[PDB]
């Protein structure tokens, strides 16, 4: 009746136990229902196939603005925060995004309240209020959102490409919008934005352009009736789907060179080729076949040779989405100092590789290898988190038939050499666009992009250059990839051992290593997680050694890259990085060949031979990387400073780059043996693996280090952990700095409570749960201080507390007063809330903390967190939630009155103020809720001095976990 059709069988992975049913309502809405009787959280998402590409020419950002407004009230639920408040009280969350052709809304919530959430949600598409008052406030949120992107290099380049194509093509539009485009200019032009928002919603939010996906515990039949009851009423305007057959880049936009000045000190080369829309060929993906080859990093690849010449370090190639009717094919690389001088040669090599592909012709075995790999990946796919899953599905329901939505973007079908040749025929010099990003162009540009202010220059590429590229011949160093030897073949799930444990067990406890093990007893997929922490005091003893630890590992990954790329493609991955206590190594994926890769890594780090050239290149990139932190956002600087302030030992970026210039090859080579001579290893092996196999992996790691590095055990007294500074009662310190790039302020306020413990943890978490929603609605929605407004707990070195983070055009001291006013408002709010409401929050937190991992790596991460923090409280959630339910409203009031209130006897407050670029100075104190009077803070002028003048907290005691 209200249903036009019900899908046949929804092809899913055999390992997938969830149930699916696809349907199309009478109004044209495509739906995918998902029943998962085990899910702790239910979720829904609706994707409207309309985006910024459809913004009216005179109101840039209208669709994005519409997106923001839909969260602030509907005819059925007028309360501007009814939606967010409801979700918050029921362990839910929500967000939405706007792209060129889509506006996607989504939320998740306790499985028991799917109906209530979905009802409030459906109203976004039935009776939005677009309240005048909300409109005038929320426009500030949009402006602030754009403001933080202004000095972001990725966004600047994004808009620059649009501004350099056909000006008449909608691809040229500014999609974010700001106060000028959404308020100032419209007012001047006599345009009523409120009307336009309604007109836009009325004209494009049509049921025929919508797709919905719902996931819950309810049966498919019940979910079917629920969806019909709430969405069949959406009106169908029979809106035509926007199409863009003419490519934004026409002839006059090809064979062009762009020289661009970046904000950060980065060096990049972007090569772009216009191509037809390849979306309809998804069954064979000719564009991805070419991306796979051109972007390959194995021996014989384009990258391998460009790196050998010392011209580039990284490369990305393949097709890039555009919109219905047009796409792009790119080849992007970063540049070394030398690579910057050889851009013409680099591009020549690009065409030589492309010519090599043309000469050999399409390779079916390559396609087949990927097809089979994709089949394996789809079959053993990890179970997704509901929210992201529904959002993703709502989006692709627009491109594939109901029955194929789950497989469409995973499985390959037919090899189409003709389509591959057709795309390859478009990758030629005559149709190339080249952009070079480098500080070396500063003062050499003559154009400015209006929306971001990007400085650049445009030149036609000389015909003789085009002609030399067209004559690209074959380069003996370029070869097609060899057969991938890492493809997994053994997928058997070993039977659960009789002595298997529900939590990780300590099966090895020696001075050289401590091994935690757990055989997967929930997911049963042929995968495993091998986590290793290598302790050594020489990884962070001083700035120079921190630099060497980083450089060492970076050089190792770089030398293993060719080898490891193939493994990565075969679903075998690894992460290796230096830490403040040593090194971290993690190998994840199919268990089959993990031992081979792991052995190779350990063997290599212990017998590593540094390439001088690679060493100099990576050192130079690292130097810029440290310097580039100055271009990060204000709130990031704020977080950075707080971290340096509150931790016993922490080397600053400045100390690191100062010590860097003295890292020499000889010094680095001497460093490695020292680093590996003495270590302690704590590991967590979790997955499709046996106790005896675990012991075997650990022994192999030990034996390899002992054999090549002569590694010996470390002394237990050497296993030092850092402490957090202990603030004095009623103390308040302020550290102030300035961000030289962004013209916006940032701030982080930290109210230190006490050492982590069951009671203290839940006191803090319950309070945060309670203020979470009100904090966002007050400081952002109501007061519009900025797009970024955050509150929540802060945990570090066993200590904890409450933190607020804000980025705004308003000065820090004003921001501080607002947070303080809000605290008092939350005070009255809590004292006035009903036991009913209070218990909702307890239950909300309970569900949040008990929501269980849906994939192996998520469960492992939780165990790893306990091991890394050395608290080893694996049954933490049950414990803490049991305690949580004990908490009363009064306990919270007392906790607030003793630790957080402005006149609390145990208030421990530190504030980091980051001033905007255009602020030469600023004080540190100064129809809105009334802000309380604040004490005079002690200004921190030197971080070292600050820490020295305060005591340090002790380290948290470990939760004893008995085992051999």
């Amino acid at each position: 009746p209200a249903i036009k059709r019900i899908g046949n069988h929804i092809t899913k992975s055999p390992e997938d136990k969830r149930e699916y049913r696809g349907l199309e309502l009478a109004n044209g809405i495509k739906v995918l229902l998902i029943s998962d009787p085990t899910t702790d959280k239910s979720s829904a998402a609706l994707d409207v196939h309309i985006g910024s590409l459809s913004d009216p020419p005179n109101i840039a950002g209208l669709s994005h603005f519409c997106q923001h407004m839909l969260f602030l009230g509907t005819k059925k639920y007028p309360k501007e925060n009814e939606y967010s408040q409801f979700l918050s009280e029921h362990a839910g969350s929500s967000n939405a995004f706007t792209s060129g052709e889509h506006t996607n809304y989504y939320f998740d919530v306790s499985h028991e309240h799917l109906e209530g959430a979905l009802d409030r949600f459906a109203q976004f598409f039935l009776c939005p209020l677009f309240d005048e008052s909300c409109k005038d406030r929320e426009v500030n949120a949009v402006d602030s959102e754009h403001e933080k992107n202004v000095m972001n290099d990725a966004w600047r380049l994004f808009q620059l490409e649009k501004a350099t194509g056909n000006p008449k093509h909608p691809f040229s539009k500014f999609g974010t919008g700001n106060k000028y485009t959404l308020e100032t200019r419209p007012n001047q032009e006599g345009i009523d934005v409120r009307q336009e928002l309604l007109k836009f919603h009325s004209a494009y939010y049509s049921s025929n352009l919508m797709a919905v996906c719902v996931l819950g515990r309810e049966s498919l039949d019940d979910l079917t009736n629920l969806v019909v009851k709430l969405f069949s009423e959406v009106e169908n305007k029979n809106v035509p789907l926007p199409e863009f057959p003419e490519h934004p880049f026409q002839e006059e936009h090809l064979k062009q060179l762009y020289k661009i000045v970046p904000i950060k000190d980065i060096r990049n080369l972007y090569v772009t080729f216009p191509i037809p829309d390849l979306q309809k060929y998804y069954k064979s993906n000719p564009g991805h076949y070419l991306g796979h080859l051109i972007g390959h990093e194995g021996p014989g690849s384009l990258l391998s040779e460009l790196k050998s010449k010392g011209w580039v370090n990284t490369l990305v190639g393949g097709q890039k989405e555009g919109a219905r009717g047009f796409m792009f094919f790119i080849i992007n690389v970063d540049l070394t100092e030398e690579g910057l001088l050889h851009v013409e040669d680099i591009i020549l090599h690009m065409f030589q590789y492309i010519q090599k592909l043309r000469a050999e012709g399409p390779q079916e075995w390559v396609f087949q290898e990927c097809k089979d790999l994709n089949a394996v990946a789809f079959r053993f796919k990890d179970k997704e988190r509901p929210r992201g899953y529904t959002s993703k599905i709502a989006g692709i329901l627009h491109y594939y038939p109901l029955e194929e939505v789950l497989t469409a973007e995973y499985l390959l079908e037919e090899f189409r050499p003709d389509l591959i040749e057709m795309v390859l025929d478009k990758l030629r010099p005559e149709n190339v666009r080249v952009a070079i990003v480098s500080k070396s162009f500063e003062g050499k540009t003559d154009r400015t992009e209006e929306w971001y202010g990007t400085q650049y220059k445009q030149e036609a590429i000389p015909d003789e250059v085009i002609k030399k590229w067209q004559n690209a011949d074959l380069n003996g160093k370029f070869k097609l990839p060899t057969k991938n030897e890492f493809i997994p073949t053994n997928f058997e799930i070993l039977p659960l051992e009789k002595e298997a444990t529900p939590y990780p067990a300590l099966i090895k406890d020696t001075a050289m290593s401590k091994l935690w093990f757990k055989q997967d007893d929930k997911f049963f997929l042929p995968k495993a997680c091998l986590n290793f922490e290598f302790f050594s005091p020489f990884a962070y003893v001083d700035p120079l050694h921190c630099n060497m630890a980083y450089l060492y590992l970076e050089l190792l990954k770089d030398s293993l890259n060719e080898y490891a790329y193939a493994a990565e493609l075969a679903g075998l991955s690894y992460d290796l990085q230096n830490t403040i206590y040593g090194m971290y190594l993690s190998v994840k994926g199919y268990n089959d060949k993990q031992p081979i890769l792991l052995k190779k890594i350990i063997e290599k780090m212990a017998t590593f031979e540094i390439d001088e050239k690679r060493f100099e290149i990576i050192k130079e990139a690292y130097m810029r990387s440290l310097n580039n932190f100055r271009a990060e956002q204000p709130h990031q600087h704020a977080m950075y400073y707080l971290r340096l302030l509150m931790t016993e030992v922490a080397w600053t970026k400045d100390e690191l780059k100062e010590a860097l210039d003295d890292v020499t090859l000889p010094r680095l080579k001497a460093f490695i043996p020292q680093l590996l001579s003495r270590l302690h290893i704590e590991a967590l092996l979790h997955g499709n693996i046996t106790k005896q196999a675990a012991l075997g992996i650990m022994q192999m790691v030990e034996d390899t280090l002992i054999e090549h590095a002569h590694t010996k055990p470390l002394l237990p007294s050497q296993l030092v952990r850092y402490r957090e500074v202990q603030l004095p009662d009623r103390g308040w310190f302020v550290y102030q700095q300035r961000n030289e790039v962004h013209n916006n302020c940032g701030i982080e306020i930290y109210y230190q409570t006490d050492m982590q413990s069951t009671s203290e943890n839940m006191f803090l978490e319950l309070f945060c749960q309670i203020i979470s929603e009100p904090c966002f609605n007050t400081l952002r929605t109501k007061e519009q201080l900025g797009y970024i407004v955050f509150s929540g707990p802060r945990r570090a070195n066993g200590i904890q507390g409450l933190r607020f983070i804000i980025q705004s055009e308003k000065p820090p001291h004003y921001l501080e007063s607002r947070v303080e006013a809000f605290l008092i408002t939350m005070e009255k709010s809590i004292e006035d809330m009903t036991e009913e409401a209070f218990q909702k929050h307890i239950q909300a937190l309970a569900i949040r903390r008990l929501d269980k991992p849906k994939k192996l790596s998520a469960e492992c991460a939780k165990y790893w967190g306990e091991i890394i923090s050395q608290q080893y409280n694996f049954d933490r959630d049950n414990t803490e939630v049991a305690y949580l339910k004990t908490l009363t409203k009064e306990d919270i009031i007392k906790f607030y009155k003793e630790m957080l209130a402005v006149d609390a006897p145990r208030r421990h407050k530190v504030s980091v103020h980051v001033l905007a670029r255009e602020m030469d100075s600023c004080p540190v104190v100064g129809n809105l809720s009334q802000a309380p009077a604040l004490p005079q803070p002690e200004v921190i002028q030197n971080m070292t001095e600050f820490k020295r003048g305060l005591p340090l907290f002790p380290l948290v005691k470990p939760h004893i976990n008995f085992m051999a």
Binding site: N95, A96, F158, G291, H292, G295, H296, G317, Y565
Partner: peptide, 11 residues
């Protein structure tokens, strides 16, 4: 290897 969205809130 082988190969911008505006949100309501930064997550």
């Amino acid at each position: 290897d082988a190969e911008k969205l505006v949100f309501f809130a930064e997550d």
